[PDB]
Amino acid sequence: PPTKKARV
Amino acid sequence: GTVNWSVEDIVKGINSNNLESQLQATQAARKLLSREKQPPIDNIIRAGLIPKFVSFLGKTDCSPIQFESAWALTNIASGTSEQTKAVVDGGAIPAFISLLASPHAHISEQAVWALGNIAGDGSAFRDLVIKHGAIDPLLALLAVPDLSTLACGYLRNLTWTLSNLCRNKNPAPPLDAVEQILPTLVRLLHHNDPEVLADSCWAISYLTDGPNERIEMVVKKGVVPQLVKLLGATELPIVTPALRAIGNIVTGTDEQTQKVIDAGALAVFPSLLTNPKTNIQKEATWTMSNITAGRQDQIQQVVNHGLVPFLVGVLSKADFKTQKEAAWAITNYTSGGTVEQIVYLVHCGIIEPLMNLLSAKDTKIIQVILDAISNIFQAAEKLGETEKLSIMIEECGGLDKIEALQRHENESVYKASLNLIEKYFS
C-alpha cells in the first residue's frame, strides 16, 4: 500500500 | 469561484481580517493542492501558509474552514518527507487529534487521513503521532456495535491510518500501542469490505514482520484461521497481504508454524504455487521454504498435502526469484527430512530441475543446490544407493555442470563441487 495519499 | 487562484491571491485572502475571505482563500488553496498535475506544495509552504492552516484547524465556530484547511494540510503532508515535516513543524499533530472528536464526520475523517499521512512518513513521526495520543480517539471512532453502519470510505480511511500506525521497523511500533490496536484490527479482519480487509491484512503483516515475540502477540489473538480464509480469497489485493502475513508467521517458531498448518493453510498452496501472479508464486514458495525448515512431522504434512510435486514444478519452470525460493525450500527439506522423505523427494523428480538450475549466473542458488545434493547423497549413503544417485545425476547432465563448477570463482562453490566429484564420481 501507499505510505501517503493525497485527496483528489 | 475558488478555481485556479494564484498563490499570491491565496495569501492576500488568508492575510485579510475577514474570516469569510480567509475561508474562500483556504478553499482555493485546497483546490490547487488537490489537482493531480504537479500540485504547488512547495509554493504553498514557501508562502508561509501552514501555520495559518493549522490555526484554522482550531476554529470550532467555522467548521468549513476547519475542513478546507484539514484537506489542504492533508495534501501537503502527502508529499515528501520534507513537506510532511513542514506540516508537523506547524503543530498539526495535536490539532488533528483534537479534530478527531469533531461532530462533523467529514472533518474527523479528514483528520484521520492527515494523521495517516504523517504516521506513514516513517517510524519517528509514527511514534510522535502515538505520543500525542492519537490511538484512543481513533479507536473510539470504531467503537460501534456494527461496523456496517459507518460510511464505507470513512471506515476505509480509519483502517488505512491504523495500518500506518502498525507499519515500519527500526524501531517497530511500541508494544503497548500494538496491544491497544490489535483487538480492533481483529474485528476489522472480519469486516466484509475488500479494501478494509486488504489494509487489515497489511497491518497484520507489518506486525508479524519481526521477532518471534511480535509474531506471538499477533498469533495469540487467534487470527491465523481468518488469515488462511483470506488466503483463499479471489481478490488479489487481499491474498497478497494475507500470504505475506502467513509467511512472516512461519518465519517464527515451529509451534507458530504449526498453528498455520493446523488452520489448513497447506490446502491452498496448490493454487498459490501455480498462481498466475509472479509475486504470489514467489511468496508462496518462500512460505513453503520456511515450512520445510521445520520439524519432520511438518515436512510430512507438506508431503501428505501433495505439495512436493508443486515444488518440483516451481523448480522446473518459474520466475528465477521463485526458483531460488524453491531451491531454498528443497535444501531445507533435505536438511531436516527423514531418509524416507528424501527418497520420496527424489521419486517426485527433483534431481533434473535441480541440476538444470546449476547453470544459473547466481552464486547463492548454486551453493544452495549443492548443499541439497550433498544432503541427498548423505541419505543415499545411509541407504547404500549412492551409485543410483550418481547415475541419475549423470544421465541428466548434472555431472558435467558439477565438474564445471569445480573451477568456479567462489570458494564454497568449488570446494563443495570438488568434494562431490571426489566422493561420488570417482
Q: What radius of gyration, in Å, describes the C-alpha atoms of chain A?
A: 6
H or E, element range at A5: none
Q: CA of A5: which chain B residue's CA is closest?
A: B78
Residue B331 burial by Cβ neighbours in a 10 Å radius (0-12, 13-18, 19+):
buried
State the angle between helix axes of B92-99 and B123-131 in degrees (0 to 180), rounded to the nearest 10: 50
Residues 6+ apart with CB under 8 A from B45: B76, B83, B86
Residues 6+ apart with CB under 8 A from B112: B100, B138, B141, B157, B158, B161
User: What secondary structure letter does DSSP report for A8?
Assistant: -
What region does B164 belong to: left with phi over 0, alpha with psi -120 to 50, or beta? alpha
Q: CA of A6: which chain B residue's CA is closest?
A: B75
**Residue contact A8–B34, C-beta within 8 A:** yes
- Reduced 3-state DSSP string for chain B: CCCCCCHHHHHHHHCCCCHHHHHHHHHHHHHHHCCCCCCCHHHHHHCCCHHHHHHHCCCCCCHHHHHHHHHHHHHHHCCCHHHHHHHHHCCHHHHHHHHCCCCCHHHHHHHHHHHHHHHHCCHHHHHHHHHCCCHHHHHHHCCCCCHHHCCHHHHHHHHHHHHHHCCCCCCCCCHHHHHHHHHHHHHHCCCCCHHHHHHHHHHHHHHHCCCHHHHHHHHHCCCHHHHHHHHCCCCHHHHHHHHHHHHHHHCCCHHHHHHHHHCCHHHHHHHHCCCCCHHHHHHHHHHHHHHCCCCHHHHHHHHHCCCHHHHHHHHHCCCHHHHHHHHHHHHHHHHHCCHHHHHHHHHCCCHHHHHHHHHCCCHHHHHHHHHHHHHHHHHHHHHCCHHHHHHHHHHCCHHHHHHHHCCCCCHHHHHHHHHHHHHHCC
**Residue contact A4–B117, C-beta within 8 A:** yes
Determine the distance in angstroms separating the CA of A5 from the nearest CA of chain B, rounded to an integer. 5
The cell for B108 is 474527523
> What's the CATH number for B1-426?
1.25.10.10
Provide, as residue numbers in chain B, all residues whose Cβ is less than 8 Å from the Cβ of A7: 34, 71, 74-75, 78, 110, 113
Determine the distance in angstroms separating the CA of A8 from the nearest CA of chain B, rounded to an integer. 5
**Residue contact A4–B77, C-beta within 8 A:** yes
Elucidation technique: X-ray
Q: Look at the alpha carbons of B73, B76, B79, B85 in this order and tell me if their dihedral is positive or negative.
A: negative
Burial B110-124 (b: 16+ CB within 10 A, else e): bbbbbbbbbbbbbee
Amino acid at B416: A
Amino acid at B359: S
Side-chain half-sphere exposure of A2, counting CA atoms within 13 A: 13
User: What secondary structure letter does DSSP report for A3?
Assistant: S
Q: Look at the alpha carbons of B85, B87, B93, B96 in this order and tell me if their dihedral is positive or negative.
A: negative
Return the closest-CA partner of residue B57 out of B73, B44, B70.
Answer: B70
Distance CA B392, CA B424 (A): 12
8 Å CB contact between B354 and B373: yes
